[PDB]
Design a protein around this ligand. Structure first.
Ligand code: HEM
Ligand code: 5TV
Length: 450
């Protein structure tokens, strides 16, 4: 019947301490001890970890009344908002809301986004000067905040960033959600709530402003390259004809931005760091750039679409250091897994971090080798060998945008600068919801064109 248990340190708390010490190592260690499927008590929750590629289809192809997302990620309600996303009234409503974000992520917008990336980096180079050292994680977070905001919200957001502290407000929301929220969703967090209200009022203002501009300039509606997520949200209704409330519009923008930022800034950090620290890798990347750029001096979309090796580097950083280390679902009915049955109420857990280091799937997995993908094709062994964007019904809809954003940023930065990373590549720090490199992450740079 039930899978093998990790014996608990204590009653209730169970395996929390070793889990909290390092959840990826926790799953590796215990998979060796107990197999492909084991269960653990963790601050009251029964958590069943699925750890081999071969068993993942049952997880990924379930429906939302078999394996529920809304039951596990509903603690995000104070960040994204009441009635939005995991706190939507239904699974169907949640799916429609996700479609509004995805509808500002079209090819047409992607061509405009490349120019945004060029513009923001040009502004950033003036702060950095011709030489120096900079924290990599912060540079990326700072660039991704301006770029993602303008990509999703339109250029009207830029004054609020540069003259109303919106970047700091985001960091206060990010500040007040920890992994413990998953276990205790009512842990009060008053600075987070203060910042969420502030961003709320700014986004309300942005919606009102946009309404005026849709009156005075209705042609924008026709032009697909100027239509951002704010615009769709103001002009689309739910499928059954119910109109959106501004509360929901606001929440959906906050959520989209939350997805738009942290995961990409972290991936960019890991990618850049490993690129510039491996001489061979850096040579191949620069040889592709020079071939694709030719005599042009700025990026455009079709150039970014030919950056295959740089794409493979990003993918390799996502194998090794996926920012979303664990994917979860609650069993609403018992579930068959292998010989076992997982019972109603257990949380199923799949980890892209664990998959990424599986010795089945990958050889020398602690080595950053983009050619493992580009030649040895190691990812395609199993159907679910690589899942840093998930799989199936709830696969990331931001994937192409993230690829575009991180390739572009790293390509532009390489065009401007020679860069050298200081010290050894860090380990992941398992202290936030979205997992990034352990500080410090510093690099030297110098401008290539005096
Ligand atoms: C490198 C950057 C990113 C990574 C690693 C990533 C990873 C993921 C993963 C693993 C999932 C599956 C979660 C699950 O099944 O429970 C997912 C879902 C999602 N991602 Fe991303 N993501 C990234 C960027 C983005 C961006 C830039 C956006 C939007 C701007 C976005 C929007 C979403 C949405 C809306 C879903 C939900 C899909 C659904 O449930 O239908 N993501 N992402
Ligand atoms: O930000 C979004 O999800 C991120 C995890 N994430 C980050 C990037 N891609 C996925 C997320 C999810 C659950 C958490 F508990 C914490 C963070 C998100 C999800 C949906 Cl369904 C809709 C929208 Cl608009 C945003």
């Amino acid at each position: 019947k039930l899978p093998p248990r990790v014996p608990n340190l204590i009653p209730y708390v169970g395996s929390f301490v070793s889990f909290a010490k390092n959840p990826v190592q926790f799953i590796i260690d215990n998979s060796k001890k107990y197999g492909d499927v084991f269960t653990a008590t963790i601050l009251g929750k029964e958590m069943t970890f699925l750890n081999h590629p071969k068993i993942l289809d049952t997880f990924f192809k379930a429906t939302d009344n078999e394996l529920s997302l809304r039951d596990v990620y509903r603690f995000m309600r104070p960040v994204f908002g009441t009635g939005v996303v995991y706190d939507a009234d239904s699974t169907e409503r949640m799916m429609e809301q996700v479609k509004f974000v995805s509808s500002g992520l079209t090819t047409a917008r992607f061509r405009v986004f490349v120019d945004i990336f060029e513009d923001e980096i040009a502004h950033k180079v003036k702060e950095l000067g011709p030489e120096g050292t900079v924290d990599v994680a912060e540079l990326m977070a700072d660039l991704i905040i301006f770029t993602a905001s303008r990509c999703l919200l339109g250029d009207e957001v830029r004054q609020y960033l540069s003259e109303k502290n919106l970047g700091k407000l985001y960091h206060d929301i990010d500040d007040g959600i920890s992994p413990l929220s998953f276990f205790y969703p009512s842990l009060p967090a008053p600075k987070r709530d203060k910042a969420r209200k502030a961003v709320g009022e700014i986004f309300q203002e942005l919606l009102d402003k946009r309404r005026e501009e849709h009156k005075k300039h209705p042609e924008r509606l026709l032009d697909e390259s100027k239509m951002d997520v704010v615009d769709h949200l103001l002009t689309q209704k739910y499928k059954d004809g119910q109109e959106l409330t501004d509360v929901h519009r606001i929440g959906i923008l906050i959520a989209g931005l939350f997805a738009g930022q942290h995961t990409s800034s972290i991936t960019s950090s890991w990618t850049l760091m490993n690129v510039i620290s491996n001489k061979k890798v850096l040579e191949k990347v620069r040889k592709e750039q020079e071939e694709i750029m030719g005599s042009d001096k700025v990026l455009d979309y079709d150039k970014v679409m030919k950056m295959d090796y740089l794409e493979a580097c990003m993918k390799e950083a996502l194998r090794m250091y996926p920012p979303l280390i664990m994917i979860m679902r609650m069993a609403r009915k018992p579930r068959e897994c292998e010989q076992y049955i997982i019972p109603k109420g257990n949380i199923l857990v799949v980890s892209p971090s664990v998959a990424g280091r599986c010795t089945d799937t990958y050889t020398n997995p602690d080595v950053f080798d983009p050619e493992r993908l580009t030649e040895r094709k190691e990812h395609e062994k199993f159907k679910y060998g690589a899942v840093p964007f998930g799989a199936g019904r709830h696969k990331c809809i931001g994937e192409n945008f993230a690829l575009l954003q991180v390739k572009s940023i790293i390509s532009i930065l390489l065009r401007y600068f020679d860069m050298e990373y200081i010290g050894k590549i860090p380990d992941p720090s398992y202290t936030s919801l979205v997992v990034g490199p352990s500080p410090p992450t510093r690099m030297r740079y110098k401008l290539r064109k005096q």
